């Protein structure tokens, strides 16, 4: 099991993450204020602990097989997630409560985009940055996390260089939240509403300063942006890897893999269908309104990302639900996304094939193939495997939603808000936790943990199986 | 392809069924009335199309291959559902709409149990009877059916045979409405509400004479009855040809079968956190009712009959939406249930198992097996195939229902309460078709043919690849 080499790197990651509780108090110096204490509590707070989870140790036991690493991600967000809640906790100027700092925080890091503070508008900078730093850093979390963690789950798709991959991710990812939060600069918003707007886009994480997201500016600028680089982001780090290890050698390098095609043809056919719809409605009165907010919510909504810029007016009923929907896909795989990605649908719907003409052509032996042939035995049941459970967890979350207090469709809503790590509600316009049963707010991070380790990863810690 | 040889057996069928319009015609002469005349049109009418299908043929090619038994059982469905709505469309007399005759007679015939006739209560008893008989009599065409498919999709669970197959289930059957409408009338039911109850409660139907069902008289005695029937009805006839092909050898005959096992499991354990939770909130005054209400219910929704005794009063609203999920199991293979029957759940929840062992173990080779192992490469992929679209089916349905017009969560009860073939509502107490959206009657008939064909069956008629 190894027990001591993990604690090791709990104190390393404690360690490492209160290093970053200097950033959002840089700010409650540079920026107004003066009230960025709870930070600098924290700082000291979690450097302590940390180097006291590893200094009683210092013994790198190096892999340590299968049961070891599903451990450690599960510790990575359980552990960081919890700490996140503490500049909250602390931090009661813009006082919250406790399941509420712990909620605002492991929705801040899971890129899930859920809060339950509001009146954000008018807050502290170190407060209002912190919350998008946490969605910045979850988000890196996340692609250094698809590239080690396929050594386990995420198959058909180690020491001492699995640092030198992130080592370039960093740059993909530094790049893009730069790239864009220049871009975010020219179309006007506030230096600091760039760069912590910047934050919480890259990570396709949902929160914002204002406190009507991207309803923000009514600028179709900004709408345009986020649209972009969500649709970039949205797609599979090692394809940029690939684009720009090199140069101008990006063209085809994506329009040859099929899950960045499948997710395009994805992006383009539900904007038809949502734009269209929009317009038989007359949802508004010009046709070009109509093309913003259609095209921006079938992409932000669709990759869990979670920005809105409507209430959803005189949209009719079909199109949120419809989109509610879509976030049980969106995000490539090694993206920033999280319903149970591309591929995995991609891989479902040819496997869903197969079966039909299984019943006709009960002889002829077909084998899925996406360039040159899944593996029929083994990547294909590891894929409708995964999609039941992902169905059974679901269910079980609405239904212990539904015990804990709170109604039936809103149950329904919360966890599939959380469940892909969408961040808003969006069934029939009831779309606000924070004031929601408190055991609830619990169930739901619960939910979003779920989310975030594509169910296996810790569903595989309930197991009789995995203790020994 | 084999056409003519099929609307040979159409006419069979068509004129086979206006020989029964006579047996409720028979009592619009009996019991009092005199207004049952739209039974003997119907009985000419049908009688006359039938031999009008079947005369101009004459054409007996037996078997056909697959892509013949395929449109059969659809058109079986199909065609008997589409004229059960005639003596409803004419009898103008308990007037209905002409969407609403097709849909109180789909859902009549396919054991479904959803009503758009409200105000049953005092009708003609003539009318009240085809009720009754149309689930009693699709009732028979579903283990018939579930017998004669095998050849097909129902896998790993002819022509001169599978007639003397039939044949035995007749008595199966018989006995049982006969078993039980006595059994009826000695709880205190009228004859006639004793073997039209005994009707719709053997083929797991769930219409009533009275209006509030099973609310009926509130006698334990009845609520006893039921229950058993249903739970006896509820489980796989092909294990009852085991104990009553010799007699006393059924003892063990059913606890060695697995799925009738693991569905005995279910109904136990559904039933006590059905039970327990009635008095943990103090839903009734007196322990006795809890024990009543909650037996009643997880076993008559659970197996997707869909009698009801209780509005749900006091009832946390969890239980009803837990007994809602619980119509996606119910009625063990070759039963008269309907959900993805209990062992598409007992496998799924086999081979969703193999797949966390995967998960710690990559290198032993686990194969699921029941008493002799099923068939990894190639059951278990129709399995969870077929779960993948139930699901897929279900989320279009409720989507067409909700562009149809009524509100999201009522969608998704009345798909949960079609697609089962379950009847009621069942969410946050909303359950009353008939003044539906009436273009979302429609949805709805297309919804519990999905449900009796257990989609691909029909699913598959919608491939290119079956059409040739
Ligand atoms: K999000
Ligand atoms: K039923």
Redesign the interface.
Known sequence: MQFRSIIRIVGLLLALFSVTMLAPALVALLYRDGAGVPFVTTFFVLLFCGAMCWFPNRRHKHELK??DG?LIVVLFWTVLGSAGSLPFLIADNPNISVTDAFFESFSALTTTGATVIVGLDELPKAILFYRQFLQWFGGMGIIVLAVAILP??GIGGMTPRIAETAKALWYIYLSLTIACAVAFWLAGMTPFDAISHSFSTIAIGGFSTHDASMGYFDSYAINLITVVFLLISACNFTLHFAAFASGGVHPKYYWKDPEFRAFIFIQVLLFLVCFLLLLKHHSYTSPYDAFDQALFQTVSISTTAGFTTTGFADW???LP??LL?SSFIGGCAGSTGGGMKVIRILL?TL??AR????????RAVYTIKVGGSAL??RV???V??????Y??VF?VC??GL??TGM???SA?SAVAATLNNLGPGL??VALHFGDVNDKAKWVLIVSMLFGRLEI?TL??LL?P??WR
């Open positions: 299968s049961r599903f386990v789950l009719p009923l079909f639900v419809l929907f479902l496997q869903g079966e039909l003409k299984r019943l006709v052509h009960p029929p035995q294909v049941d590891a409708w495997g995964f999609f039941s459970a169905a059974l269910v609405m239904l539904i015990a109604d039936e469709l329904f069934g029939e296996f569903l595989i197991t199986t995995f």
